[PDB]
């Protein structure tokens, strides 16, 4: 076996399962990216780089030219996929072991073939072509943006661009102080539904409050035979 690996995110506090014809290497926490020195570098949610075995609000440290290193001494951030657990009505940052309720879990699975992701740009879940086996389906996740640090994006062919559950706020921000929370500048971008007749028409404005699947593109990840 050649051993191509990928990652799967449950978007919940419980560990997901590896799909068919894949073996579990290790399980961990869904890492989305890091914001150091006001620069947001993201991890591909399809690769193993998005699945850390241990969770912490500050998983790294800075080291300057005077041969000293500072850990959690200044203000840097980390990014993690979040669960559907509602934040408390006090809408205060979560700290301590209550952070368990909000950090998604993940697994890293090895298989003999490669993994791709297909996006339909419509309401129909696309089927994979001949010779490919379906593992899971979801919604087309493009990127997430923060204020004045840029953002973190997913490659549309990586399985990380196909989240099994749609979330208006799929990513949570954690600080070196040891707390995580949602912040208003955190936005999420998804592929929209585009009919064949809408390909060259001026887009019409629409603010959705509910019934989101009518405007969210469907996706499917598949392995090869």
């Amino acid at each position: 076996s050649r051993g191509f690996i990928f990652a799967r995110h449950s978007q919940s506090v419980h560990v997901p399962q590896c799909p068919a014809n894949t073996n579990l290497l290790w399980e961990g926490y869904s890492l989305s990216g890091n914001v150091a020195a006001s620069r947001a570098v993201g991890q591909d949610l399809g690769q193993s780089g998005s699945c850390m075995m241990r969770f912490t609000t500050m998983p790294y440290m800075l080291c300057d030219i005077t041969n000293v290193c500072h850990f959690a001494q200044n203000n840097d951030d980390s990014l993690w996929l979040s669960t559907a657990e509602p934040m408390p009505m006090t809408m205060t940052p979560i700290q301590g072991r209550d952070l368990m309720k909000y950090i998604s879990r993940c697994v890293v699975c090895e298989t003999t073939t490669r993994i791709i992701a297909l996006h339909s740009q419509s309401m129909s879940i696309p089927d994979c072509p001949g010779g490919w086996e379906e593992m899971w389906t979801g919604y087309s996740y493009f990127m997430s943006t923060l204020d004045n640090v840029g953002g973190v994006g997913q490659n549309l062919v990586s399985p990380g661009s196909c989240l099994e559950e749609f979330r208006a706020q799929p990513v949570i921000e954690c600080h070196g102080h040891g707390r995580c929370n949602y912040y208003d500048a955190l936005a999420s971008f998804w592929l929209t539904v585009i009919e064949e007749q809408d390909q060259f028409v001026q887009p019409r404005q629409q603010t959705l409050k509910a019934d989101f699947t009518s405007k969210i593109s469907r996706c499917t990840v598949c392995r090869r035979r």
Partner: protein
């Protein structure tokens, strides 16, 4: 046995390209460079299937925020797409007129892996021993546009080398307005021709003019194992 590698080629023309050799065509579409959402540029590598979007739109994405609210064409986002060889217009083209300015692409399946090699000289580099050539062109590295607009392709990806050399290889589409146009803030970056220099010599300032540009760009070849 086939492991499942996918390759993507962009025609840079109004016609949809066809897959090379005995590779099975998976889908066709339009060449997407990057999306500028909330003044952040997120790119799709031109050698990745994500850069080939089957259904076009000046705003193929929508944003979601707090209080479980999503918005489509509700702000000031823009998109950038690879161009064709059409004539540069005088004003932003509208709706159906933009189709003649958007490049077409195709995504295929390959049995073995595919990479790209660069010579950094005027000569086209040869594939490594055991690898066959697919197409040749000019080494395309990164790009810069208006505001925080920018991005680039990985040097091992086939997207790092486009066939034609173009001083204006991408176009900016106003998302909510549905119009596209070229602007002077657009800048293309190509790998340089280093045949007249030694690896540690100081670069000499050069102003290249009409027609002289193709001679200063590095050549390339995209290769696959047979």
């Amino acid at each position: 046995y086939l492991t499942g590698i996918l390759i993507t080629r962009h025609s840079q023309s109004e016609t949809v390209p066809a897959c090379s050799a005995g590779h099975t065509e998976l889908w066709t579409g339009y060449s997407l460079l990057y999306v500028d959402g909330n003044d952040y540029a997120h790119n799709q590598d031109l050698g990745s299937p994500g850069s080939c979007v089957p259904r076009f739109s000046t705003l193929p994405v929508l944003s979601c925020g707090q209080n479980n609210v999503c918005n489509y064409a509700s702000r000031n986002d823009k998109t950038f797409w690879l161009t064709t060889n059409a004539a540069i217009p005088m004003m932003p083209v509208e709706n159906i007129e933009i189709r003649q300015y958007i490049s077409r692409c195709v995504v295929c399946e390959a049995p073995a892996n595919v990479i790209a090699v660069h010579s950094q000289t005027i000569e086209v580099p040869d594939c490594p021993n055991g690898w066959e050539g697919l197409w040749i062109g000019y080494s395309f590295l990164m790009h810069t546009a208006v505001g925080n607009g920018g991005g680039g392709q990985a040097l091992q990806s086939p997207g790092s080398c486009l066939e034609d050399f173009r001083a204006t290889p991408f176009i900016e589409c106003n998302g909510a307005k549905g119009t596209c146009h070229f602007y002077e803030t657009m800048t293309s970056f190509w790998m340089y021709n280093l045949e007249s220099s030694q690896p540690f010599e100081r670069p000499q300032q050069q102003t290249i003019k009409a027609g002289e540009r193709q001679s200063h760009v590095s050549r390339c070849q995209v290769c696959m194992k047979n």
